[PDB]
Design a protein around this ligand. Sequence first.
Ligand SMILES: *[C@@H]1O[C@H](CO)[C@@H](O[C@@H]2O[C@H](CO)[C@@H](O[C@@H]3O[C@H](CO[C@H]4O[C@H](CO[C@H]5O[C@H](CO)[C@@H](O)[C@H](O)[C@@H]5O)[C@@H](O)[C@H](O[C@H]5O[C@H](CO)[C@@H](O)[C@H](O)[C@@H]5O)[C@@H]4O)[C@@H](O)[C@H](O[C@H]4O[C@H](CO)[C@@H](O)[C@H](O)[C@@H]4O)[C@@H]3O)[C@H](O)[C@H]2NC(C)=O)[C@H](O)[C@H]1NC(C)=O
Ligand SMILES: *[C@@H]1O[C@H](CO)[C@@H](O[C@@H]2O[C@H](CO)[C@@H](O[C@@H]3O[C@H](CO[C@H]4O[C@H](CO[C@H]5O[C@H](CO)[C@@H](O)[C@H](O)[C@@H]5O)[C@@H](O)[C@H](O[C@H]5O[C@H](CO)[C@@H](O)[C@H](O)[C@@H]5O)[C@@H]4O)[C@@H](O)[C@H](O[C@H]4O[C@H](CO)[C@@H](O)[C@H](O)[C@@H]4O)[C@@H]3O)[C@H](O)[C@H]2NC(C)=O)[C@H](O)[C@H]1NC(C)=O
Ligand SMILES: *[C@@H]1O[C@H](CO)[C@@H](O[C@@H]2O[C@H](CO)[C@@H](O[C@@H]3O[C@H](CO[C@H]4O[C@H](CO[C@H]5O[C@H](CO)[C@@H](O)[C@H](O)[C@@H]5O)[C@@H](O)[C@H](O[C@H]5O[C@H](CO)[C@@H](O)[C@H](O)[C@@H]5O)[C@@H]4O)[C@@H](O)[C@H](O)[C@@H]3O)[C@H](O)[C@H]2NC(C)=O)[C@H](O)[C@H]1NC(C)=O
Ligand SMILES: *[C@@H]1O[C@H](CO)[C@@H](O[C@@H]2O[C@H](CO)[C@@H](O[C@@H]3O[C@H](CO[C@H]4O[C@H](CO[C@H]5O[C@H](CO)[C@@H](O)[C@H](O)[C@@H]5O)[C@@H](O)[C@H](O[C@H]5O[C@H](CO)[C@@H](O)[C@H](O)[C@@H]5O)[C@@H]4O)[C@@H](O)[C@H](O)[C@@H]3O)[C@H](O)[C@H]2NC(C)=O)[C@H](O)[C@H]1NC(C)=O
Ligand SMILES: *[C@@H]1O[C@H](CO)[C@@H](O[C@@H]2O[C@H](CO)[C@@H](O)[C@H](O)[C@H]2NC(C)=O)[C@H](O)[C@H]1NC(C)=O
Ligand SMILES: *[C@@H]1O[C@H](CO)[C@@H](O[C@@H]2O[C@H](CO)[C@@H](O)[C@H](O)[C@H]2NC(C)=O)[C@H](O)[C@H]1NC(C)=O
Ligand SMILES: *[C@@H]1O[C@H](CO)[C@@H](O[C@@H]2O[C@H](CO)[C@@H](O)[C@H](O)[C@H]2NC(C)=O)[C@H](O)[C@H]1NC(C)=O
Ligand SMILES: CCC(CC)O[C@@H]1C=C(C(=O)O)C[C@H](N)[C@H]1NC(C)=O
Ligand SMILES: CCC(CC)O[C@@H]1C=C(C(=O)O)C[C@H](N)[C@H]1NC(C)=O
Ligand SMILES: CCC(CC)O[C@@H]1C=C(C(=O)O)C[C@H](N)[C@H]1NC(C)=O
Ligand SMILES: CCC(CC)O[C@@H]1C=C(C(=O)O)C[C@H](N)[C@H]1NC(C)=O
Ligand SMILES: *[C@@H]1O[C@H](CO)[C@@H](O)[C@H](O)[C@H]1NC(C)=O
Ligand SMILES: [Ca+2]
Ligand SMILES: [Ca+2]
Ligand SMILES: [Ca+2]
Ligand SMILES: [Ca+2]
Lengths: 389, 389, 389, 389
Amino acid sequence: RTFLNLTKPLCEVNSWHILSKDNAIRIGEDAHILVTREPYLSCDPQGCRMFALSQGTTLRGRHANGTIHDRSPFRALISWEMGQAPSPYNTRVECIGWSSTSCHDGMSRMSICMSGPNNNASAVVWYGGRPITEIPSWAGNILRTQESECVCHKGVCPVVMTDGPANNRAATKIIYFKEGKIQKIEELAGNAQHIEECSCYGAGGVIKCICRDNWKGANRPVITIDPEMMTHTSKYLCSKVLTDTSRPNDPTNGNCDAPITGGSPDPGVKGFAFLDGENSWLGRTISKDSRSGYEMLKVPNAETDIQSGPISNQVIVNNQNWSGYSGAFIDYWANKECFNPCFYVELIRGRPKESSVLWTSNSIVALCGSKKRLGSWSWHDGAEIIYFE
Amino acid sequence: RTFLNLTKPLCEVNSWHILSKDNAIRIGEDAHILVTREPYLSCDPQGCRMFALSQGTTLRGRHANGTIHDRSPFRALISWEMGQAPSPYNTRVECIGWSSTSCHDGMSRMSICMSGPNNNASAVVWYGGRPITEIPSWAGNILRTQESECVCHKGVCPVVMTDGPANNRAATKIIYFKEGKIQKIEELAGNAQHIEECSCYGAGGVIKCICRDNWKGANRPVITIDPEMMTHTSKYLCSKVLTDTSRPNDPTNGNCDAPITGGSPDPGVKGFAFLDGENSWLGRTISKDSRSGYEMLKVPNAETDIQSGPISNQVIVNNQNWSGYSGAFIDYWANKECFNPCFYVELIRGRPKESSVLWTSNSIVALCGSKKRLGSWSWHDGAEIIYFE
Amino acid sequence: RTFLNLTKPLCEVNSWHILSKDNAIRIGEDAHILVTREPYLSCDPQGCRMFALSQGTTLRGRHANGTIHDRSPFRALISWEMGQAPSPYNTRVECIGWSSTSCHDGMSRMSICMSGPNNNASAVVWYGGRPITEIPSWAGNILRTQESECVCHKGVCPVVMTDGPANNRAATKIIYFKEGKIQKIEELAGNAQHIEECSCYGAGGVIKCICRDNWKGANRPVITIDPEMMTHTSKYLCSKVLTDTSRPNDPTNGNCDAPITGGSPDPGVKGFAFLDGENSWLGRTISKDSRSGYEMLKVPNAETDIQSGPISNQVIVNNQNWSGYSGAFIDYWANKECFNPCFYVELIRGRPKESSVLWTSNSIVALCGSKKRLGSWSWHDGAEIIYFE
Amino acid sequence: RTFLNLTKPLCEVNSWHILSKDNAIRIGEDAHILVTREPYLSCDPQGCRMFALSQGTTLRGRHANGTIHDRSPFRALISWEMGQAPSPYNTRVECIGWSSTSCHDGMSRMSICMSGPNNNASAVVWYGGRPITEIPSWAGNILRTQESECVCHKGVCPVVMTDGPANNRAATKIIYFKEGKIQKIEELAGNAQHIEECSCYGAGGVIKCICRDNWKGANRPVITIDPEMMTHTSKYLCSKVLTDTSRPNDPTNGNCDAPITGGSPDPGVKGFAFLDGENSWLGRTISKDSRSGYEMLKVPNAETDIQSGPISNQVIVNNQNWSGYSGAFIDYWANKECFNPCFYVELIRGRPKESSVLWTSNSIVALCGSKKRLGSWSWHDGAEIIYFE
Ligand SMILES: *[C@@H]1O[C@H](CO)[C@@H](O[C@@H]2O[C@H](CO)[C@@H](O[C@@H]3O[C@H](CO[C@H]4O[C@H](CO[C@H]5O[C@H](CO)[C@@H](O)[C@H](O)[C@@H]5O)[C@@H](O)[C@H](O[C@H]5O[C@H](CO)[C@@H](O)[C@H](O)[C@@H]5O)[C@@H]4O)[C@@H](O)[C@H](O[C@H]4O[C@H](CO)[C@@H](O)[C@H](O)[C@@H]4O)[C@@H]3O)[C@H](O)[C@H]2NC(C)=O)[C@H](O)[C@H]1NC(C)=O
Ligand SMILES: *[C@@H]1O[C@H](CO)[C@@H](O[C@@H]2O[C@H](CO)[C@@H](O[C@@H]3O[C@H](CO[C@H]4O[C@H](CO[C@H]5O[C@H](CO)[C@@H](O)[C@H](O)[C@@H]5O)[C@@H](O)[C@H](O[C@H]5O[C@H](CO)[C@@H](O)[C@H](O)[C@@H]5O)[C@@H]4O)[C@@H](O)[C@H](O[C@H]4O[C@H](CO)[C@@H](O)[C@H](O)[C@@H]4O)[C@@H]3O)[C@H](O)[C@H]2NC(C)=O)[C@H](O)[C@H]1NC(C)=O
Ligand SMILES: *[C@@H]1O[C@H](CO)[C@@H](O[C@@H]2O[C@H](CO)[C@@H](O[C@@H]3O[C@H](CO[C@H]4O[C@H](CO[C@H]5O[C@H](CO)[C@@H](O)[C@H](O)[C@@H]5O)[C@@H](O)[C@H](O[C@H]5O[C@H](CO)[C@@H](O)[C@H](O)[C@@H]5O)[C@@H]4O)[C@@H](O)[C@H](O)[C@@H]3O)[C@H](O)[C@H]2NC(C)=O)[C@H](O)[C@H]1NC(C)=O
Ligand SMILES: *[C@@H]1O[C@H](CO)[C@@H](O[C@@H]2O[C@H](CO)[C@@H](O[C@@H]3O[C@H](CO[C@H]4O[C@H](CO[C@H]5O[C@H](CO)[C@@H](O)[C@H](O)[C@@H]5O)[C@@H](O)[C@H](O[C@H]5O[C@H](CO)[C@@H](O)[C@H](O)[C@@H]5O)[C@@H]4O)[C@@H](O)[C@H](O)[C@@H]3O)[C@H](O)[C@H]2NC(C)=O)[C@H](O)[C@H]1NC(C)=O
Ligand SMILES: *[C@@H]1O[C@H](CO)[C@@H](O[C@@H]2O[C@H](CO)[C@@H](O)[C@H](O)[C@H]2NC(C)=O)[C@H](O)[C@H]1NC(C)=O
Ligand SMILES: *[C@@H]1O[C@H](CO)[C@@H](O[C@@H]2O[C@H](CO)[C@@H](O)[C@H](O)[C@H]2NC(C)=O)[C@H](O)[C@H]1NC(C)=O
Ligand SMILES: *[C@@H]1O[C@H](CO)[C@@H](O[C@@H]2O[C@H](CO)[C@@H](O)[C@H](O)[C@H]2NC(C)=O)[C@H](O)[C@H]1NC(C)=O
Ligand SMILES: CCC(CC)O[C@@H]1C=C(C(=O)O)C[C@H](N)[C@H]1NC(C)=O
Ligand SMILES: CCC(CC)O[C@@H]1C=C(C(=O)O)C[C@H](N)[C@H]1NC(C)=O
Ligand SMILES: CCC(CC)O[C@@H]1C=C(C(=O)O)C[C@H](N)[C@H]1NC(C)=O
Ligand SMILES: CCC(CC)O[C@@H]1C=C(C(=O)O)C[C@H](N)[C@H]1NC(C)=O
Ligand SMILES: *[C@@H]1O[C@H](CO)[C@@H](O)[C@H](O)[C@H]1NC(C)=O
Ligand SMILES: [Ca+2]
Ligand SMILES: [Ca+2]
Ligand SMILES: [Ca+2]
Ligand SMILES: [Ca+2]
């Protein structure tokens, strides 16, 4: 039992295989399943777990009414065994709040939750199930973080947090933790103009965080982190293949160093990418307007080449079904010589796209890379909204 | 593993961070959640757990009708993983009865329940999950105890118990346990005139229990116990900031050595304080009349100065929401050179304040100290009573 | 871990303290609780568990209809953590069938279930969770066993089984198991004329089993087993305090060596006694006709003196409430120099006594000895049958 | 822990004893039980577990409507503690998909699930709870596998898989795994003309797989695997006692090297046999047309002798009750000098035979061999379909 070192390179990926699917909304039509959103997965030496923000109600409960609302005192980060649906009976409360991240350093799990009023939020940083550190809001406007896993190297786990406007310049910082205790704080530097909801992974001693610019860019920011020196750089994905939502049509040429703007009507969604030269994969919603569909695109040199475009594709969720947030995680403790990319998609059901119900929740699907050429089908949520009417 | 000793000082506390919230009434509107009251938390080397007295029914069950009643043969002390709500599926029965305390000595957990008729109640003392000792009523009138955790030092865990009237002089004893066996029994000594429902914590080799005088006093008794010498003293909180409910307006001067009378309509509520010179915090309901709201007041020298008043505050539960009991606990096994104060508030829903339902139950919120200046918002229960009509 | 040796005497018992209560019918009015009957408790080095025969349905399920029926292919011996109610989610299936026993030898648990048709039943004997031995019916008429725990000594665990009529002379055997394998089989010897449902405990190298004569006697048979020699004797309880149900009024003199007839209208009920000279306690129903109420009577020399009568009494279940089977168990792994007697009462609800519902089920209460003089109250089931109409 | 080696012979079997029964449909009438089909059991050093393919809904859920359908993105292989019913709360997700196998090699469990569209399905091979290998369809037509446990020897676990028509010649392969990695792939050889849903067990260094010829034969194919050389042969069960469903009347002689055709209206059902000279047992449905009843027949030399017929029988499920799939498993880690045959019967309820409900599910019964002559009765599902109307 030792601190995780990000020594290994990323595995070659040619297609994506199914890892897990919880069918939460289908099950929760009758069983006692908690209302969630903002899910993710995170692993540790023993296996992987699902994580999400509970709304502190079940899906069939009367309190599901009004769960489109983002921030309340009734939310918490919960975790559970991968593949089960989240019930009041099988879920571990990691921390209390309405924005989270979590990662395992090889010894113990760090979980962070922000809570409080918009003008005076605070994070509590847990390690090994105990609270270690608290961090007050520095800009007085919804202190918040990744909504997917963080990554650790030799016990140091960088976390990206933002405080400030969601629709204008904000105050992002990279906080470097060890055993839950702040080792260093950096202000965001570089050419990314706005940072939300980073999706982060490690390979060859480098952590890359692929984020949501909610202010300008339909191209995604990328923060590159050295967890040994505890330093970073930022810019945008170079590729012309735009991967936020909403977004305009892909232009001739992307831009490494500035946002590519446009699209309607929404300013962003959490997303991810794996960036490894020829071995690069970008996720995005199929729709360039709405959180519908989900596709993986193999885009060689997406990180460096403004003319890069897709050479493969795999549909994860068909464009007749609702998607949601997406994020990266890796089973860093697999018995492999390489770290194999994995990702999840949040399958949002209910408001605001399905207004015949009073609630908003999600289910989860997760996939990992394969070097083989595997066939694909759509892993949509599967619930019938009529049954909830 | 070793027996806990209380040699560490209390941590400096400048504000309170969220530790846990179970949202039990919201969840229990639809899921199978047990009806409880008299909750608390208690920790051990592995972590902290939630505790409460079940009523032996679920919240939506027909048998929730009538659960304002305090003492029945269907009640039990239950414990569960911190943050979950208490269901029939995730709860451990610690002991049977209708008044309890529990605490971990570093090796094993002691749990004590009282049961029986009013005139012939008895305690059963459990240690490591096995029954060790039984204690028959000495005064023939509802033998009872703290309703929050006890504290242990070098194997010795003092517990404060009362037997006798709730509205007149009663027979309080301090019973000193080791591995669930009585080491010594003391009658209450000193200037506290009536003792109920002590909230106790250790620091600096000293256990302080802040109690409820249900006879005359709107100021809270304080018992100070030396667990090495197995002796105690008692008096009242000196501060003019009165902390029982009901209470009169705060007077110009408190009284260290007599009850301050007044207040309407209720004789008392379980509460707590942390008393550490300048580093002193008093909890109380916001209402001076009713169990609504909850505030933390930093009252330097509350223990010693009749003129001591607040220098800061933090609303825990707004005064538009119901509160209930509150009590002290500490994670004495944290990785810290000091013991950090924690507390909970019982958020009572249903009767008698909400008589549109037939039941009485509660949810839990718990917070711990921070040296930082954290923002705050109200952590009220969050259930809509209309949904239960 | 080591094999249990019955090296200690019984503890002195002056009164009985509450050990556990599951409130299963109150909870199972709304939560998913299995229909059961024939419960017991059994301990091991880690603590004690509850056991019962499930009916393979929940209480509120439609399949609860008709659960007065004793023997179906849907029944199983389930065990669960002491104090919880038995749900589909917290119960361990020990074995399949409609009559059982179970005991822990200090290394692993042996469980035995009988199943099959009346004329062709069979036992399966499990050890450490694996099936070891099978035993075919020898008399072609409902091969069956204790319905409470067995007892082990130096790895030898005797079990009493009957096969044959319930209303005439039957073929009872004592089978001595070690690690689930048969060591020896004895035909019943001595003066007991009919044996059902033995309740057994150990002390001082002797196992005593207090049974139900369903044929003739209102006095209970007593089998005395030597688990080292693997031999036994039998007779009846001597006391004039008759403890089966139904029974006649207590005569002025018992009978050590023949059944005392009389009683209407029930031929018997499972019960128990602790027999230890002056330290002897007899349980029975308060009603002499019906499974109503439950009392403990201290009857010095009940085992040897036909004139022995009660010197003290404790009501366990008042005679306005339903009782049921009762049986013995001991926490042989307690940290005491003596083995402390415990018992349980099955609190039967529904048919036949409560015919306004379609089901028959039970809850459990359990108590253990105290040397103190504890007060008592009634530990009845607590469910309101009207809520199930 | 060490790799399992198939060193032991089969145990003599003269009758079958009950091992487990989950009563899932009875319980699931009211409790939250997943819809399933294609169940099995599989053991490991600690005991045995139940397995099945969930439909990603509860039985009383609205999503149970349409669960006759075989292949959806909402299915998964789930496992749970033997004898419990499968709920969302007690089931482990082994892998995602709509065809499976699993087996333990003595060190860890391998589980394999196929998912995807009919023309582009893929297997994912898990070991120790982590994905190891992926296998794309080779024939573009529902890559699929055993639907009961595989068997391992010295770390090598062969698995039979088919891809191609269900009603014509298909491409079957035997894939030999070690630690979830492919050691060798063989095309099916020998005289079996069509292979589906193999039921496999090991004894004396040989693995025997008794399968389903869904194209022609009402006699069952038998694949014999040498797990050290990683080679096999195939033919049919010799015996005139035909054991697929549907089937014609048993002919005067069977045929070891070609299918015996006929029967109406269905082309096959998954089944099993244990083949060990005299000590040979064949399962089959009692009906020759429908999945009704289930019987075990002792058919000496069924593997070699075309004139072999039954010398004994045991009814497992009477012919007034629905059966379903059946399969082999063995507790290879029992404390016996032989490996004792076990099997399960899938008890299918709902569509198509019970059209008054919208769903299809099942419960499980499992039995193992006994050398004794045990009595038997019918272990039918036991649910009342009227309660679901
Ligand atoms: C970001 O978050 C942080 C932390 O969550 C937060 O920090 C707080 O900042 C405020 C100032 O903005 C601090 O407030 C101070 O509180 C001091 C003590 O207040 C309590 O006690 C008062 C005295 O009570 C006694 O006597 C009265 C009158 O006779 C009697 O009613 C009482 O029963 C008792 O006997 C009391 O009046 C006061 O009441 C307020 O709060 C209660 C709930 O507790 C509420 O019910 C009341 O309605 C009322 O709101 C309170 O209970 C106080 O002495 C201090 O006042 C001095 O300084 C101010 C300048 O700020 C002067 O105006 C004043 O003259 C005083 O000399 C001041 O009010 C608070 O302590 C901080 N808390 C912490 C934990 O740091 C920030 O506000 C947040 N930022 C944003 C933008 O939200
Ligand atoms: C605090 O709680 C404790 C714990 O429960 C409690 O302590 C008990 O105190 C009472 C006295 O208050 C003690 O009662 C004694 O019991 C003796 C034995 O009684 C049993 O047997 C009697 C005879 O039974 C046989 O004979 C009759 C024919 O005579 C026949 O019907 C029977 O079938 C049988 O053959 C029997 O009469 C008696 O019945 C009582 O109790 C049963 C429940 O078991 C109930 O259903 C009946 O309605 C009835 O109440 C019982 O079954 C008894 O010998 C003894 O009598 C002497 O003492 C009293 C004074 O106490 C004298 O008045 C009398 O003349 C005798 O000299 C007495 O009844 C009991 O043993 C204590 N138990 C323990 C565990 O200590 C405290 O009272 C509680 N305090 C408060 C304030 O509530
Ligand atoms: C077994 O399943 C396999 C796994 O899914 C499958 O293998 C797949 O085979 C298909 C057909 O051969 C291959 O498709 C090839 O894909 C590349 C990549 O195409 C993607 O990118 C292009 C270009 O996008 C950009 O420019 C367009 C054009 O101007 C803009 O609109 C856009 O915004 C971008 O700037 C895009 O046009 C493609 O569009 C397809 O896919 C999406 C979903 O991702 C649909 O929404 C869309 O309508 C259309 O169907 C696509 O996004 C392409 O260049 C080649 O020409 C070819 O199309 C897959 O790559 C291959 N996948 C893998 C993982 O191997 C097998 O086909 C399947 N077998 C069977 C029998 O079903
Ligand atoms: C305690 O329970 C014991 C456990 O069950 C039980 O012991 C059983 O005792 C019975 C009665 O002695 C024995 O029966 C014997 O069985 C053999 C084999 O019978 C099976 O095979 C024959 C031949 O089948 C083939 O040919 C026929 C006709 O041409 C075809 O129809 C069939 O397809 C085959 O091609 C078959 O006729 C038998 O049919 C019976 O059983 C089936 C269920 O399997 C029913 O559907 C059917 O109606 C009929 O009842 C059977 O399948 C036979 O050859 C002997 O002559 C004799 O019948 C059991 O073998 C024996 N079992 C064991 C495991 O020991 C005890 O009886 C019981 N005690 C009490 C008191 O109940
Ligand atoms: C869902 O929640 C909304 C918001 O609380 C409920 O709408 C309120 O209903 C109350 C009681 O009738 C009104 O007095 C409020 O003014 C309404 N508020 C708003 C914002 O509309 C609605 O009733 C709930 N629906 C259900 C079915 O519970
Ligand atoms: C809640 O509990 C009360 C008390 O048992 C019930 O009130 C009784 O109702 C019974 C049955 O109709 C009447 O005979 C009595 O008049 C009532 N007793 C008292 C003290 O009021 C009430 O019915 C229960 N309510 C529900 C909905 O279960
Ligand atoms: C069960 O599932 C079927 C299939 O989805 C449902 O049938 C549909 O019902 C809707 C609403 O009545 C109709 O618009 C469609 O025409 C039907 N579709 C088909 C394919 O038949 C059926 O309603 C469901 N039944 C229940 C009780 O949920
Ligand atoms: C507050 C800004 C932030 C990022 C743009 O909004 C997020 C957008 C969300 C969204 O676009 O769906 C939902 C998130 N729950 C919300 N985060 C919080 C903490 O409320
Ligand atoms: C019996 C006196 C005691 C302290 C005043 O009453 C308490 C008051 C209560 C209260 O004020 O809410 C509830 C407690 N459940 C009750 N305790 C018992 C054991 O019934
Ligand atoms: C079959 C005789 C036996 C003992 C008299 O009957 C018992 C009586 C019972 C009873 O008196 O309540 C219930 C038991 N479940 C039953 N046992 C079985 C195996 O059916
Ligand atoms: C696809 C052919 C295959 C074997 C003949 O059909 C099976 C028949 C079934 C059956 O006969 O009941 C149900 C199985 N779930 C199905 N398998 C799959 C993967 O769909
Ligand atoms: C108290 O516990 C601490 C930490 O285990 C230990 O170092 C110290 O010696 C203890 N003091 C006493 C007097 O037991
Ligand atoms: Ca954007
Ligand atoms: Ca008071
Ligand atoms: Ca009798
Ligand atoms: Ca066939």
